[model samples]
Target: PTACRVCGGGVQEFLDLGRQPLSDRFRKPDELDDEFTYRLAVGRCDSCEMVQLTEEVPRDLMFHEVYPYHSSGSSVMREHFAMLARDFLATELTGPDPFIVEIGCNDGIMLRTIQEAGVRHLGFEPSSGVAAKAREKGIRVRTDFFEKATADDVRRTEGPANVIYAANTLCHIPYVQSVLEGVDALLAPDGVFVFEDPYLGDIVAKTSFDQIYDEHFFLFSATSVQGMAQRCGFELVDVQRLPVHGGEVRYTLARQGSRTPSAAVAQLLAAEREQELSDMATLRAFAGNVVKIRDELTALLHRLRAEGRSVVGYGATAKSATVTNFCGIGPDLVHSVYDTTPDKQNRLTPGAHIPVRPASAFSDPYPDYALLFAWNHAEEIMAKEQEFHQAGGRWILYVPEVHIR
Candidate 1:
């Protein structure tokens, strides 16, 4: 416990965010018997600059088989995954029998692409609800959590895959070493383990402190990632800076020396070194700006509502929960939010009684103005919701301050 996950004896500093509801755990009216509290403390591992939640959440309870969330709601994300699968299957994957395995493969979004390439794929997802959907799509998904035993079974039964991927799922897991061991058990000696998640450097650069919620255990920087991968007996071969999920790093890992670092890697490492990525001064500045964001956005929204201009939220996402809770948003500013996920449609957003309604609510009409909570996927939302603009409805984005579309 004294050692940082990345560096054995790295210096670590702690930052806390009092009590909070689990980010995506919007409560159903009848499901109130088990009220839960969340803890938030982000740390800077001085040697690696891996900003991570200092404490652990019991994984068994966190990713219970009934895990409740869907990934198909965002049209943009669907396309992104499709494109990702297409690329890997065509380029990286070889051998007529090579397979692809995805950890935390919710609803088989990525696996579907692998299947389309005439290759085999297996998905590991604990959530029964979403796993069923994946099975329906003809993707072989085990409705179970990823562990060394499960990994061994999968490898023996159907794998030793050419690639293993986990997108936005690594941070949610608390048993970090177990996950690495699972990867070791599952991955082909020649396979690559690739994943994409919010980058710690970008979070600090953009002051996206809200990314630190209960579900996210590790906020990885490039150095920390390279360190983590190496400790697991694999070397980080490459990383791609894609503008997916606001700011994310796509990490590629394989057995040591199997691949070489591209020039881009050197440039990014240089950029981070120049910024002092592991320094407290950098993180403190980000923490301070986070405060500025909440105040600025709150005042802007209040001013708009004061003029009797109606507004609503476009995406009822986990980030929205953090942003709303931090800004103290209530019905006064946002009466309701439209969401595509049926499970979330009738639930109340955590810490606020704001009702989540089906996007169908906006079918017949759109409000004078709407707040875009899923701003990261802005392009997809705007294109799909063309009706909003056609009906004279203006959409507002808050990332760089409030603006109308």
Candidate 2:
């Protein structure tokens, strides 16, 4: 915990969220006898300026056969992946027999388009249930984690890939060195490795402290990603800011000196520098804002309860565990959580023990207020659940601050 996992630098702790549970562990009632917990804290590496979790959670405990997240759950995400696939097809996958590999391609949401286009594609999904869903869609998937050995095996069996892609998955890995080395081993000479994850600048700007959970081991920025790419024999060629999942940046990496860095990459780095994205002082200020938001959110929930108004949660998302557990907002304040994922339905929220119901339940007899846990997909959810708002139901949002709408 003292050393940075990426560069072996001294890590200076900045914020601690206290004891937290596995964010995605939607537990059965009987399994509540003994729950696993860990101190959730964030820090900055003095050497590489990488913002990462001080404590590492075992991979198996976080990802396995029963992993509940499905990439295709949201229509917005499905459209996002489809557009990305089309972009790659028009640009990167134009070469003869171009092969693309996707790391943690949950349910093959992105690779489905590649498969339909007759382009060779493979998805590495460790979760058995989601991998099965991907296979059912006729997408080629390997049910294993992507690392050096597995990447080598894929290269030997399926040949070198022209494009390697990961969405919201790379940041979850603490052993990023192995993954980058694997990218080196599996990529073709001019191949590019692309990944998109929650941007550190966005997290700090929005005070989205819930993003600092067990799964998200690192919160990436232009500076840290560029340094990481260089250290692993790759160059950060391009950086594209994305609006999905709160806010993110799509980073493009190529073999060192193979491609000219894009102007946007330098522009983004300059902007981050101006914003002090990696400075400890900026992060400490963000921490202070997080505490304020937590206090305001819990107080609002308590006031709503005292007013005899029924409140429910809109999304049983993984990030909700941090908010619910950290703010000590349990079932007493919120009745239940509604989500679209079948695996999450009928189960309890990770640490809060709030029952998770189907998304349909949100309208069976709408509550007076709905807490927007999946604020990243707020637009889509609000649009879909317009009837809730039309019926005089309000929403509680706590991203930048605690506010009701």
Candidate 3:
């Protein structure tokens, strides 16, 4: 039996996604030799009820100098993080000489606003490329991963932080115990450790199995986060559901007994219990639905090809790696995947080997059907590409169910 990373409880396997390559490892045609692959499986801990990947991917390989994702890529996320920074400044950073620390501050999207306000801030970004981009924006950054030792070093030099925040990053960490211990050491007495990540309840409700990949080591729930907080001498003080990234929950932790727990915390915890978010039966049912989606999506693509319809994929996202590889989609079905990120444009999708083209190619001559891999940014993408729908092009979506619009 595999032991849980957060608690010592036995983890029962629920879903197996078969062999998958590193989701973000877009490869050049000539550089396709011996692609790394692993069996992507998920399980839930019996005692703490935490859902996590059964296998661990090394940290350095996933996040390093050439890491390709930028947090400020979308207009929606830019606005979201800017607003979040203002909220923290107004409510939490009012104390004299308050300092804010952000973990995995990719491109310093949130801290840019904080810096503009002349606030003291430090961004810990391990990826050197994105860290350089943040430095260019005049945001202070440390090109190092945040762990207990790093936190201790920061506390010794820079003093305790008034707020330690992370967005779409905490779930990627498998050594969360060390991170939480570091948070305990670095956070000021009244400081809050806030993070937001993909919610497990949303995954089960939406059947978004593609959210499980090499980078996403854990799918968080209010219950599991509370369990982790208590174990690390912190209290879950607040909870807020976010609509971004399909669905997410913003969790705020304060040192034990330092702050009053908000009603939203109990509310979300109750909802998780009522929905059975952690039950193995519920997870197994979600897995069954995932198989149906894979079959239906593949069948739809095959039918489109039979009718000689041109089909291309939009957004060569990391999530697309799972769907394309799991459902056996290739260039025969999808001519290419179009994305805005330059690093991925001239490469092939991780395991499926579908060519990735620039976003301009998406509308150069719109395809009959476009598979929307970046479904989380649906509203933003659809609004930006209104001409595609006007040209009678349909969007293929597989989240709630395999369907075309």
Candidate 4:
């Protein structure tokens, strides 16, 4: 419509992914035609190196009060949270009265661990359903969105925190300034505000077109991250190479003068400059690769289904929506996807309307070809379900390409 949401960049038409229901808002069969148009404008920010949809999807329409997206359902994510909690708390923010605050702390996965270790902690989760679950575990959870006001309120109640963590949360809201300001006010003098999100670098390199859901307003690059932090009166301390969400980045930030500049920041910045994140040439090339991927995948899937072999999918992860819709794939090509998320188990996918079942379905009626939508966790999924391979079933991975082997 206008310019970009965060950077006021001139918008350009990229792809029309057609109409699809809210990705995670799996609807009942009665609400079939009430789908929404999903466009791939692929806006390139003139100022920041952020790529995103120009229009903002209303928050309420997406995250319902009973918001069903929970991380506890995934055993893979549980171990991920456990590792982060044990590592960060024991090393970086170690102290007698050390505390951590997590925004969008779905089901309190990490916060629960921090609290169980006798460390005081707080979780700000907007979803009433998840927040209620977190409180039951004895962690003080604010059942409200983390804005400037919420941060101030938490600071008054529990005091400033030593570690303010917002993994995969910052991009959910349109108001970045408010969250950053609140982070500044609620963080201890030497506190570090760390966040891990879908990194822009990985999205381009791996052709991860699935990462751009309506909830994700701003796609971030390490360069843009440093600039945004500086504008918020914070210094970008370091960038940790994260392997989650199909290759991501964990940023470490602190008040401008509170911490020394780590060598990691400069090294990453040097890498960014070499790549030219904002240049139209670079963005356009990445965008072109996505189109190529979609077409290639469409042809491959059609050929597979023509062979008349049974095909079911795996992992009803968020990004799977993008893949299903973009390649013009629907329930006809895939039977159902097996997800560990309980919220998604009994539900159907966005546009495809493919039913989602539990991981146990992998044992029943093992399909001839299984598509790996959650390819990032390929190793884990493969390891946990070795029975499929042993039964002469082959996996189809569509990232670089598709093959039934």
Candidate 5:
């Protein structure tokens, strides 16, 4: 609390969105009487340049028996992960008795390929619901959060790991120090710890303030990652710019001096320097852009409602909760939200209380316009809902700007 989570440096609050509900905590209509909320604010570390949430929700509450997100839900993501596992197997996991450990193996989307290959692997998943699903697929999963103690146990029982990777999971963990400790204990001499999360550079460039939700505590950058890795005896050797999840960076960390630092890492660092990404002036400018987006989105939604055009949200995404509540949008603007997740169906959206319905709700008598809340997954969602577009239905997108596309 005294300093930044990564470097313990002075941190300055940049943007505050006031109190917000847990983004993914969909609830039954009867459960509105009791709901948890927390103040939502973002800050940047003056020394390390890391952007992170100023407040953290209890880890267990965000991920546990009732956790509802499944990585395998998207066919695109499943294929994307399959290719990643295959590439790793052909390259990194080729040692004798090679081993791979995946953190937050939600529904075993990434680990299923390893299991199919009959390679030695272990999956660490805290959510019992998704872990059970993984187990049913014969994926060896431990229903526990990855920490120092758990890492020691994994090393003792499973030996050193050849590759330890996390996708969109590492940033959810607030205790970055403990996670690096686990990586140090479990990794082999040449093993690498690879992770990807929404990039701070992308967030600032796109004015995607919705990315500052509860689950995503940290938005990573190369400058901040390097300092954090060094503190835990790891080196940031490689950085891959990935287009997935609204712009993300795949960072590769290994025991100090285990591998050569990639040119991509140097390139991104140089770019950050040129942009003055860590400066107070740039951060303050980002806050100004966020306010403009909030005002513009609300006005557009209100105008559409006034014109008697029915608008429904395409996906009941966790990030949508931030956009809806922070912008003061409710059923008057967006009638209901359509989602494919069973746990979200028949429930009300967090804070906004917009109805969450099955994917079937997006058929036949479609709304005049659909709000693309999951803009990051636009490729997949748009392709599937092409019929809606063909029927003269337009999409309302708010990221980067508030406009109909």
Candidate 6:
């Protein structure tokens, strides 16, 4: 941890979130005693300005045989990924014997579209559950982590990938240089590498401290991305701002000068510089904002309890782990969390020990307030839970402040 993963620079600690459990490790009531916890902290590189977690959790502990999250669980994400697949097929997969490679292709949400067209495609997924589900749909996927060796194996057996893409997966791996080497080894000479993850700017603006967890090792900004890509023998060619997952950036990169850099890349880089996104002062301001949000949320929950109002949590999201544990919330504040995931239901939330029940718990006898833990999927959840709103149930959002709407 002496040097930055991207640029061998001195790292300075910014925020220490104390002991935290695996965000997605929902546990049965009987198994609560065996939960694993670690010091969850974040820091920034003095030279490269890359924001990353100070502690690294073993990848096997976070993503395993039964990874609980499925990308297609949300209708919004399913449609969004499908649309992206279609666009890539129309634009990038036009050449003869074209091929595509997707990293962490959860449940084949995007690759299914490519498979339907009888295209040559491969997905690298380490999570066995989702990988099996994708295989069931006739999508070619290997249940192994992608590294330089694996990339070489794929290239030798399947051939060079015309396009290598990832979604919300790149930030999870702290050994980013290894992945970049794999990308360079597998990608075609004229191919592009595309990936999208939650952006640091959005997290700062929204005070979404929950986004900093065990799995998400890095929070990418345009400045950090540009510097990292350059060091890894690639150039950031394009940047597309997406209004999904609490604001993400779809970054497109090509081997150094292989393609003309789009105006969006320069524009975002300039904007990051203008806002001093990489400055220590900006990070301190963000830390101050995070403290304010925690205080505000705790006070609001206390007031609600004093008023004898029933409050429940909506969506047993991984992000909820950080918020609940850091804010010291428990069953006293939110009685239960409702989630549709089979494995998560009937379990206690990791670290907080808040009970999680079936989504059906959200019904006619709705609670007075529902804490919207899955704020990133707000549009889809709100639309689906119209009955709750019609029945006079209010939603509480912590990010961007405690908003009761």
| lDDT (tens digit, per residue) of candidate 5 on 224-329 | 8988888778999999988888999999998998788999888998999899876778878988998998998888888888899899998889999889889898
Residues forming the 10-long window of minimal summed lDDT in candidate 2: 27-36
Residue-level lDDT of model 4, residues 1-405, one tens digit each, is 456554455655443444445677776556656677555445665665556666667777777675777877656778988899998777766887888888889888888888888888888887888888888888888778887898998889789899988888887777777888799779998889888888888877776777877777777777888878876789888888887768888899988988887898899889878987656777777778888888887787777789997888988877778888777788888888888877777778887788888888779468888888888888888998888898988898866555466
Query: What stretches of model 5 exceed 4 Å from their correct place?
Result: none
Overall lDDT per candidate, in order of appearance:
0.77, 0.94, 0.93, 0.78, 0.89, 0.91
Clashes of each: 0, 0, 0, 0, 0, 0
C-alpha root-mean-square deviation, candidate 4: 2.1
Per-prediction RMSD in angstroms? 2.5, 0.9, 0.8, 2.1, 1.1, 1.0
Query: What C-alpha lDDT, on a 0 to 100 scale, does residue 28 get in candidate 1?
Result: 75
List the pairs of residues colliding in candidate 2: none
What are the runs in model 6 whose C-alpha is more than 4 Å off? none
RMSD of candidate 6 to true structure, Å: 1.0
Ten contiguous residues with the weakest lDDT in model 6: 1-10
Query: Candidate 5, clashing residue pairs?
Result: none
Q: Mind sharing the TM-score for model 3?
A: 0.99
Candidate number that wins on TM-score, 1 or 6:
6
Please tell me which model should have the higher lDDT, number 4 or number 6: 6
C-alpha-based local distance difference test score of model 1 = 0.77
Displacement of residue 293 (Cα, Å) in model 4 is: 1.4
lDDT of 4 at 206: 77
Q: Show pairs that collide, candidate 6.
A: none
Model 6: per-residue lDDT, tens digit, 1-405?
A: 556877879888878888998999988888836778989888899988999888889989988897899888899998999999999999889998999999999799999999998889999999999899999989999998887889989989989988999999999988888889999999999998999999998988888898988889999998999999999899999999999989999999899989999999999999889988878888888888888888999999999999999999999999899999889999999999999888899999998899999888789899999999999989889998999999999999987888899
Model 6 alpha-carbon miss at residue 244, Å: 0.7
Off-target runs (Cα >4 Å) in candidate 4 are 1-20, 36-40
lDDT of 2 by residue, 269-384 (tens): 99999988889999999999999999899999999999999999999999999999999999999989999999999989988899999998788478999999999999999999
List, residue by residue over 362-389, the lDDT tens digit for candidate 3: 7747899999999999999999899999
